[PDB]
Design a protein around this ligand. Structure first.
Ligand SMILES: CC(C)(CO)[C@H](O)C(=O)NCCCO
Ligand SMILES: CC(C)(CO)[C@H](O)C(=O)NCCCO
Ligand code: NA
Ligand code: NA
Ligand code: NA
Ligand code: NA
Lengths: 307, 307
């Protein structure tokens, strides 16, 4: 029967790359990928290039219908480029590779002829401070929708897409596990803004940032493989991030493989799995494009929304 | 601060009419309006004409971005006109005038040069049969989201927008208060499809018809005035619809003004008000355009979504 989606295997999807030129070195790609991730230039060629093409086709088009409303409203046509910013949402579970996906994507789009100003903002900066989470009793629901200042977030994206010259976002420290006092990420009328986070695709009784997305990605994989990736990476960090004496999780650095597995498995089932099942996965149906990864992190399937 | 919306008063909105020609007689308009409604040609000139213009500007534009995805996919350009159907959602409370709004709109759009095939479908046809509602114990939640076969509904709209040649919808009898056995409304690849219903703008954990709307209307008024309109019309029907011996509500025809008011007030607070507050109003933020009516049914304010 009819469907709003059209599935692709990697063979079918890579052919849609066309002439899209690869503007990324092997060394540039590594400073973009996170611990555990297996993304290489082949994947950036057979997957991210078609995606970048599809995106560029729609930036021009998306611009046409904001112009229709401008024409209808008896309005000018504000400086070119200073068209309406194209907002892209990248969602998915913790440890699924979505932040790398978002970084790679910002890289590819920034290297487009025109030379678009492409900004990337993670929702981390929009988490409530630990003190405020403690107050609302949310220190163990960090990542759940309620642990974010969604008002501020919505104001931020609304501000950018409405044409503001500059919008500020708080900044989150992973080293300190908390929001950084005084820190701000300033976004200045970018041509494209990618917003990456766990629940960005969420919907509700009020207008949310998902309602401002012109395009969205949902990096998917089966729950069991993601837990494995999460646990694996938790263990690997004992010698990277947790090794830092200043790390809020420095006590984990000394855990044994077995002790670390138990700890990582517990956080997964008490925080990350529940959030994935209750809040993140239910948003997957609305994503313009879903990137399905196999147990080895390899993106071998895609689901696109034609309707 | 920045906003996704831009408010208008009738003076500001009527000026956006431009050259839009009025193709509707006074007599045509009456066979389109419901009991109690006060819509006249002036309102169709100062309100529905700008709306029809704005809509036409976007049908062309909306077409551009379905073409981008076609271009990207290495596809042809299917027969012209046989472009992708433009889906319009019209929501709002029972008795707010939304069905008239939808009928007037279908009329105005059908009379556009090209001569678009403009179909209108009410979600009534998608209510579960009384027998099935009795089974799920829903005979008094008729109108609530759960009293509708949303799967079938979604399949219907998906079918039409995906390019099907014909799609069928069940038919609801207001005379008999139930779905009509064997009846079907056949929709054949229209250029525009207007879907009118209480919860059409609803959102959820699955892709819904609201996600297929290219444009949506939400006819609004303050809850107190709508109850008044509902009650008033309930009383007026004693001599129109309830007067019919075959009417499922023929017992109401003999009620006294006071008896009828008590009955109408009870249905309003036990079914229609709760549904309006819990399910319909929460969808209002997402409507492309909101038509705000004053206590006298007069549309004197509009809220448009620019973002
Ligand atoms: C969502 C995020 C990862 C943001 O940093 C948050 O810190 C979190 O998930 N806390 C519980 C442990 C997850 O590793
Ligand atoms: C929603 C609809 C009006 C559809 O006909 C439904 O019959 C209903 O609202 N029943 C309760 C009484 C409302 O008058
Ligand atoms: Na990382
Ligand atoms: Na903000
Ligand atoms: Na009517
Ligand atoms: Na159906």
């Amino acid at each position: 029967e009819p469907s709003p989606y059209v599935e692709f295997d990697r063979r079918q999807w890579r052919a849609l790359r066309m002439s899209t030129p690869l503007a990324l070195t092997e060394e540039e790609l590594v400073g973009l990928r996170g611990l555990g991730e297996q993304i290489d230039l082949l994947e950036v060629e057979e997957v991210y290039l078609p995606l970048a093409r599809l995106i560029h086709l729609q930036v021009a088009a998306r611009q046409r219908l904001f112009a229709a409303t401008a024409e209808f409203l008896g309005e000018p046509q504000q400086n070119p480029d200073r068209p309406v910013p194209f907002i892209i949402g990248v969602a998915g579970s913790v440890a699924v590779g979505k932040s790398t996906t978002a970084r790679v994507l910002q890289a590819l789009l920034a290297r487009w002829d025109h030379h678009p100003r492409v900004d990337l903002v993670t929702t981390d900066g929009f988490l409530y401070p630990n003190a405020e989470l403690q107050r609302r009793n949310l220190m163990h629901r960090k990542g759940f929708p309620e642990s974010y200042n969604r008002r501020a977030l919505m104001r931020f994206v609304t501000s950018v897409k409405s044409g503001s010259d500059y919008a500020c976002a708080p900044v989150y420290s992973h080293l300190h596990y908390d929001i950084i006092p005084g820190a701000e990420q300033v976004v200045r009328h970018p041509d494209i803004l990618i917003l990456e986070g766990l629940n960005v695709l969420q919907t509700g009784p009020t207008l949310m940032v998902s309602d401002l997305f012109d395009f969205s990605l949902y990096v998917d994989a089966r729950i069991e493989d993601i837990e494995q990736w999460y646990v694996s990476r938790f263990l690997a960090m004992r010698t990277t991030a947790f090794a830092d004496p200043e790390s809020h999780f420095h006590h984990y650095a000394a855990f044994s493989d077995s002790q670390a597995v138990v700890a990582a498995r517990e956080i997964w089932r008490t925080i990350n799995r529940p959030n994935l099942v209750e809040n993140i996965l239910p948003t997957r149906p609305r994503a313009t494009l879903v990137l399905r990864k196999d147990a080895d992190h390899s993106i071998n399937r895609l689901r696109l929304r034609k309707l």
